[PDB]
Amino acid sequence: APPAKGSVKVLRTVATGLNSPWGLAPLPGGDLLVSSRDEATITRVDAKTGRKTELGEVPGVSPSGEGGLLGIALSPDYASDHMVYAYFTSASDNRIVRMLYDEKKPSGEQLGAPDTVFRGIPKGVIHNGGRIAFGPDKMLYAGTGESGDTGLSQDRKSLGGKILRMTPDGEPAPGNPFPGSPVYSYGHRNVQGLAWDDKQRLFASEFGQDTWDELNAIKPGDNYGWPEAEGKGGGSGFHDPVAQWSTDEASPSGIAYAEGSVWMAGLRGERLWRIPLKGTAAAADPQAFLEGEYGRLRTVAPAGGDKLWLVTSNTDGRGDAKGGDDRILELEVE
Numbered sequence: 001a002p003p004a005k006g007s008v009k010v011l012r013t014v015a016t017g018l019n020s021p022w023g024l025a026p027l028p029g030g031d032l033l034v035s036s037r038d039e040a041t042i043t044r045v046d047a048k049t050g051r052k053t054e055l056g057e058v059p060g061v062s063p064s065g066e067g068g069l070l071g072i073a074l075s076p077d078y079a080s081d082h083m084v085y086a087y088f089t090s091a092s093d094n095r096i097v098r099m100l101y102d103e104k105k106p107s108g109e110q111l112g113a114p115d116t117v118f119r120g121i122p123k124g125v126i127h128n129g130g131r132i133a134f135g136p137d138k139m140l141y142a143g144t145g146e147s148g149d150t151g152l153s154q155d156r157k158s159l160g161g162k163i164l165r166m167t168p169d170g171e172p173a174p175g176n177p178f179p180g181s182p183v184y185s186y187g188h189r190n191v192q193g194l195a196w197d198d199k200q201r202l203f204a205s206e207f208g209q210d211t212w213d214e215l216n217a218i219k220p221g222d223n224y225g226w227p228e229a230e231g232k233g234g235g236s237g238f239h240d241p242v243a244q245w246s247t248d249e250a251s252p253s254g255i256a257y258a259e260g261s262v263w264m265a266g267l268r269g270e271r272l273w274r275i276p277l278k279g280t281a282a283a284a285d286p287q288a289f290l291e292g293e294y295g296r297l298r299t300v301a302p303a304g305g306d307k308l309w310l311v312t313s314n315t316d317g318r319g320d321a322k323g324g325d326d327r328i329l330e331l332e333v334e
């Protein structure tokens with residue numbers, strides 16, 4: 001369905017001056033919530049003006065290296081329950097909490113005390129994963145990393161190097177591949193992107209080491225090969241990527257599905273990748289857009305129809321931040 005050749009138009013800059021923006025949760029009314037990894041804040045961005053409101057600081061966050069306040073996601077029933085979920089690196093682990101958001105409260109006081117729904121994910125200075133999202137099945141999904149310990153990914157008993165699927169209350173999701181376990185898929189290095197297509201099939205981005213970054217089509221119980229395999233050609237028993245990229249051209253974090261393609265934000269690549277899909281295969285060659293125009297790109301989210309939100313990441317410790325960084329852009333895509 002999507003054309004082989006795509007396009008990306010930057011309609012406008014929506015907001016500026018964000019610090020280490022990471023998680024992005026589009027609100028029903030058109031506004032955005034954005035987390036800061038290193039400041040541990042969640043901030044509301046007014047879509048029209050770019051005006052920023054600090055909701056508050058998430059308690060218990062311990063930023064260091066790639067860890068800190070990471071993915072955020074609205075409850076599937078957010079419109080009525082006003083619950084915001086957050087994945088973050090604590091003193092001891094990575095974990096997921098939920099907080100009651102009340103926009104009628106003073107700035108800084110808008111987040112209720114966190115309810116911890118899931119704990120115990122391995123942490124390190126690197127490879128903490130951190131992207132969370134609710135699937136069309138109303139279950140909570142989380143990408144993790146192996147924390148720099150390559151031995152965790154293949155170990156079904158370790159929460160490191162996995163995609164997890166749980167109830168919103170933090171219990172293993174009914175119908176998961178392994179009895180009593182929140183593990184959905186394994187053999188992952190570091191996963192910071194999740195998105196579903198129109199047929200409710202999950203895709204995930206992944207950072208490779210020095211050779212191949214990945215876009216994977218995720219099936220429950222499948223083994224994506226890390227650390228014995230990296231990129232395509234993993235061998236029998238391993239599930240290969242839909243597409244792979246050199247680490248200098250990608251190093252991908254967030255992904256979004258829109259207009260029949262996966263859109264993938266590249267950090268080191270400083271570019272937005274388009275992967276048009278036919279079923280769970282690439283329909284045509286992936287194409288990159290915006291290379292070096294806005295620096296590092298971390299997060300991309302659907303804004304409805306042919307529109308995307310895109311978040312830069314030049315303030316995350318590995319960029320050269322320019323005046324006004326980091327920013328959110330509005331894109332119109334094909």
Ligand SMILES: O=C(O)c1cc(C(=O)O)c2c(n1)C(=O)C(=O)c1cc(C(=O)O)[nH]c1-2
Binds near residue numbers: 207208269
């Ligand atoms: O191979 C690379 O050049 C490269 C670059 C980056 C980056 O641009 O920050 C990451 C990685 N690799 C990587 O493997 C990884 O897990 C990772 C996590 C992050 C992040 O900032 O959260 N960046 C990177």
Ligand SMILES: O[C@@H]1[C@@H](O)[C@@H](O)CO[C@H]1O
Binds near residue numbers: 248
């Ligand atoms: O190193 C390059 C950088 O200069 C920019 O072009 C983005 O892509 C990276 O591979």
Ligand SMILES: O[C@@H]1[C@@H](O)[C@@H](O)CO[C@H]1O
Binds near residue numbers: 001002199277278279
């Ligand atoms: O039928 C598939 C549809 O599900 C979508 O993936 C686009 O490609 C078509 O061939």
Ligand SMILES: [Ca+2]
Binds near residue numbers: 209210
């Ligand atoms: Ca890498």
Ligand SMILES: [Ca+2]
Binds near residue numbers: 225226239
């Ligand atoms: Ca793999």
